[PDB]
Amino acid sequence: SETRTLQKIREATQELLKYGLLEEASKPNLYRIVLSHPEEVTRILEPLDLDIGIDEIRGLLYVKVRLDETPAQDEWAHPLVRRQRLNLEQSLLVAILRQHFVAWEQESGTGASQAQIAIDDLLPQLQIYLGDPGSESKERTRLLTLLDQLKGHGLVTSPDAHERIVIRPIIAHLADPINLQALLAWLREQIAQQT
Amino acid sequence: SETRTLQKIREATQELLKYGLLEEASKPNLYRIVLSHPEEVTRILEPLDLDIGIDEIRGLLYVKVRLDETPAQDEWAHPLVRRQRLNLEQSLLVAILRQHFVAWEQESGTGASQAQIAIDDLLPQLQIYLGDPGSESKERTRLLTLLDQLKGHGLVTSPDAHERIVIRPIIAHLADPINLQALLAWLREQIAQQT
Amino acid sequence: LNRSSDDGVTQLLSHIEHEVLVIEERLNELNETMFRVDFQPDRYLRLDTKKVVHESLRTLEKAQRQLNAARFVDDNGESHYKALQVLVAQLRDASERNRTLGAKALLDPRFRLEFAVSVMDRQSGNVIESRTGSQGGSGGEKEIIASYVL
Amino acid sequence: KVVHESLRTLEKAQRQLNAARFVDDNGESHYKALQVLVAQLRDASERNRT
Amino acid sequence: SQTVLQARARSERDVRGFMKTGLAAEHHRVGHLLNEFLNLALKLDWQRQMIRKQEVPLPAVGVAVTGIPAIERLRFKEVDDEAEQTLDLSNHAADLTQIGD
Amino acid sequence: IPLEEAIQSLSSILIEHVSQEQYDINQDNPFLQASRELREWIKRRLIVER
Amino acid sequence: FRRVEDSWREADRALRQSIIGEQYHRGDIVERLLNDQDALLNTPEGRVFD
Amino acid sequence: KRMSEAKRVDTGALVEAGADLDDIPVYLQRLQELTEEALPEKLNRFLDY
Amino acid sequence: TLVDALMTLLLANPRYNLASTGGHESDRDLISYVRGVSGPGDGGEGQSHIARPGKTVTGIAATLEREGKQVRLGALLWFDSTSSSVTDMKRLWLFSDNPGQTLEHWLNVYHEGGTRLLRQMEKEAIGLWTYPNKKQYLARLRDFFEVGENAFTLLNRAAGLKQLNSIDEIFRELVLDDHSAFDRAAEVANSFDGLTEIHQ
């Protein structure tokens, strides 16, 4: 009875809803398509109070609650998007990666291809604030576990074949980087005072 | 400029997505709302390849994966469907459940979703198939584990205080004549190779 | 197809990067001027510029690399043609939709290097600030920022 | 005082509804007019920023 | 004695209940299919508990979607910092006046 | 017998006969072994539990 | 006693298996149900036990 | 095929039955009941209200 | 900053730093003031631009006089973590006709105990009412002063708003109380939903 949306747009939409992201590195032709058809996208999403934010510098599309201003509850509540509060380890890794992305773009400009970061340097950095669970093996294992969780949120790649990793430009739009950096500086200062 | 869909429609549709189904006796408002604009609902979901069935005679609604532009497919493979496919162990319980559901319907009517059974009644039924490991702890454990998996698919409420449960009527639309027929066909196919 | 070459994009990008370099050089001169004045009661001011590399040129170079790979491959020049076609079609899509900020980024030297402001220590040259606009403020901070930059 | 196209149209709808109730039919007209009137109501309540 | 009596009566109750259940559905449209399915199932070995763990193409009804991965859902640990208590209240001399030209 | 009461008594009896070396009766946690062995006597149908 | 329970259980599984075998044969099913007597009469035990 | 279309349009009791000849008798029963019991009373209430 | 403190005491959602704009924008905010923000800093770890990064508490208040009786309003804003967003901020609002209930007493009470002890302080005291939630706070404020919240909004924007670019906005929004019947029209539209459902 009814006509059916363009298949490509439906594809991009469904992927973007599974992963909250679409990227030149992942579905670049879908990326071009949605860029030529954003109105269709937002129209599809708006009944759900969903809407994309976009990043043409870094070839990243991403989602964001579309709810309106001055809500009755000061902060939005959305039936679908359940919220998480990360454990310190994860949050710390995210802050680390965030300032990493910032430094990389500082030295290389905006949109420059990320250089890879070594587990070999991560485990030290975790060691900076986390002490030691009992062994380097446990450090590396839990590092890879948390990296898996982070890739679960799409903020990083998988642990690559060379025990480095790459950052996902979704980091460029986290919830509140001020929370990250305040915590990071506070943590390093706290450890410097404690020692 | 903007043509924001009925915010009420937005609430009802987003809730319905949040739960996969929607029951009148529980949430009659969004239920009627979708009944009020089933076409708008549909066209909203159509980009996602998600479609709404209906059961007024019992007070139910629910999604169901579309089958177009990539013909047929094993529905479950769709990205957005969020759980792993039923497995014939589950199905073995499913059949029993459906039997009880239809049996109770055929004597109390179709006027309630309150088709109920006591867990202990299932025990003999499974005992025939899953056997008799002779320890109520093991069998009841496996029984509740199955039930849990099913409530994951939303078919049955978890046990109450009285060790009694309510079958969700969506069960009926799972234990379709057509689907049951495809199942019996594939099952006889399995029999023919098991021999 | 063999007569097709990267000569077109190399000269264009060379001129564009020359424009970017000219912009940055004159920004350096303006910084020299900015190194003489004092902005706050205990600071002097500097301007900033970073390099912008868009997703458009990122895909451009990916398509260029895949085109070079397509020359390694041989399928009667059809993969070669398809790669060159995606590349040139993206170029023409930028020209056609030049209005969209993506095409502007892909073509515009002005887009190809971002700008910001920072506050400097007259004593040591250290920095703790970087302002992209003039937000916040008490009244007068905006005046100084706007007057200086303008 | 100004009667914007919105209020003019709503009053037109009131007249239409009056007309539709007068005509007796399969309910198509009466329902149609009442529904478009309520539709103006809903559109105003929804897009109260326009 | 009573123990065995109850173990008997319980099984009796269960079997009578199964009798009533099968009876009604014995011919109803779906019920007959269900019985067919029951018997085809009897042939399978359920003690192969984790190998006949085999997926069937049943319909996908009740497909909810939730946990849409929106970046906004992220929030960071409330790392408590307790360097001191908030007891300070004084007015200080920070309201004193001395100004330049 | 209550299940874990049996676990306890069996573990007590197990330690008594750890001196029967050839059967390697567990020492580091005889209670856990009592559990892992009641599992066996259920699985082998010596003791249905209800 | 331990054996009498086994007899009941065996008769139970037998009856249920058979009645799965009689998918559609309402005749026997109603014949059993209408009867007042136990459906699990494993007399060799049952009757002696009684 | 048309039985399947009927189910696709279906909203209520037709789920009990499939897309076969045996389902046809119920299709007819429901068609009669719709035409006779349902439609007139629904129109009654709708127009009345 | 001080004017913004006043506006925070008064309004639910004031346009902070409105004056710098001239009447049509605000770009500072509650939490920035609570944490003593002053500029961007390096924006990667630098806490200099943010004066009170650690667990901090902030309070502001004022007292007026009509016919010799003085009314003081107050508020408390404290974080318990390095977290730097509104959600991790805890609130209090204060409303007193008793002059003895000063910001010093309230701050002392908080020092003595968290939100619970502030509740106990409200229980103990007379002429004092305080609310962690702003709705009830401004409701009591408004039924006390007998001027709608719209009045306070006009007050804030009036602090600046030298433009009067066009009268229509100024009046219709800032000046005139609101009783547009969107809710009532929805109410009417909804009564008809029943009929619509029988139709469907």
Coordinates of C-alpha atoms in Angstrom, one line a residue, chain E:
Chain E
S1 CA 4.2 -44.2 54.0
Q2 CA 2.7 -40.7 53.8
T3 CA 5.8 -39.6 51.9
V4 CA 5.2 -42.1 49.1
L5 CA 1.5 -41.4 49.2
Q6 CA 2.1 -37.8 48.5
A7 CA 4.7 -38.5 45.8
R8 CA 2.0 -40.6 44.2
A9 CA -0.9 -38.1 44.5
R10 CA 1.3 -35.3 43.1
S11 CA 2.2 -37.3 40.0
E12 CA -1.5 -38.4 39.7
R13 CA -2.5 -34.7 39.8
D14 CA 0.0 -33.8 37.2
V15 CA -1.0 -36.6 34.8
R16 CA -4.7 -35.8 35.2
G17 CA -4.0 -32.2 34.4
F18 CA -2.0 -33.2 31.4
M19 CA -4.9 -35.3 30.4
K20 CA -7.3 -32.4 30.5
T21 CA -4.9 -30.2 28.6
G22 CA -4.3 -32.5 25.8
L23 CA -7.9 -33.4 25.5
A24 CA -9.2 -29.9 24.6
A25 CA -6.5 -29.0 22.2
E26 CA -6.6 -32.5 20.7
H27 CA -8.3 -31.2 17.6
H28 CA -8.2 -27.4 17.7
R29 CA -6.5 -25.9 14.7
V30 CA -3.2 -25.1 16.3
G31 CA -3.5 -27.8 19.0
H32 CA -3.3 -30.6 16.5
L33 CA -0.1 -29.0 15.0
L34 CA 1.2 -28.8 18.6
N35 CA 0.7 -32.5 19.2
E36 CA 2.4 -33.2 15.9
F37 CA 5.3 -31.1 17.1
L38 CA 5.3 -33.0 20.5
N39 CA 5.7 -36.4 18.9
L40 CA 8.4 -35.3 16.4
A41 CA 10.2 -33.9 19.4
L42 CA 10.0 -37.2 21.3
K43 CA 12.5 -38.7 18.8
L44 CA 15.2 -36.2 19.7
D45 CA 17.7 -36.9 22.5
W46 CA 17.3 -34.3 25.1
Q47 CA 20.2 -35.6 27.1
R48 CA 22.4 -34.2 24.3
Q49 CA 21.8 -31.1 26.2
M50 CA 24.2 -28.8 24.4
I51 CA 24.5 -30.2 20.9
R52 CA 20.8 -30.2 20.0
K53 CA 21.0 -26.6 21.1
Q54 CA 19.9 -25.9 17.5
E55 CA 18.3 -22.7 16.2
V56 CA 14.9 -22.8 14.6
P57 CA 13.3 -20.2 12.2
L58 CA 10.4 -19.2 14.4
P59 CA 8.8 -15.8 13.9
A60 CA 10.3 -12.7 15.5
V61 CA 7.5 -11.2 17.5
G62 CA 8.0 -8.7 20.3
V63 CA 11.2 -7.4 18.8
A64 CA 12.0 -4.5 21.1
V65 CA 14.8 -2.0 20.5
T66 CA 16.5 -0.1 23.3
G67 CA 19.8 1.0 24.6
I68 CA 20.3 3.0 21.4
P69 CA 24.0 3.9 21.6
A70 CA 23.8 7.7 21.9
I71 CA 27.0 9.4 23.1
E72 CA 24.9 11.4 25.6
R73 CA 24.2 8.3 27.7
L74 CA 27.8 8.5 28.9
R75 CA 28.6 9.9 32.3
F76 CA 31.8 9.7 34.4
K77 CA 32.6 8.4 37.8
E78 CA 31.8 10.6 40.8
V79 CA 35.3 10.5 42.1
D80 CA 34.9 11.8 45.6
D81 CA 37.5 14.3 46.7
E82 CA 37.7 14.9 50.4
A83 CA 40.8 17.0 51.0
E84 CA 38.9 18.9 53.7
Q85 CA 35.5 19.7 55.1
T86 CA 33.5 22.7 54.0
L87 CA 33.6 24.3 57.4
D88 CA 35.1 27.6 56.3
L89 CA 32.6 30.5 56.4
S90 CA 34.5 33.6 57.5
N91 CA 33.8 37.0 56.0
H92 CA 37.6 37.7 55.7
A93 CA 39.1 41.0 54.8
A94 CA 38.3 40.2 51.2
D95 CA 35.7 43.0 51.4
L96 CA 38.4 45.6 52.2
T97 CA 39.2 48.5 49.8
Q98 CA 42.4 49.8 48.2
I99 CA 42.5 50.9 44.6
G100 CA 44.8 52.4 42.0
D101 CA 44.8 55.5 39.9

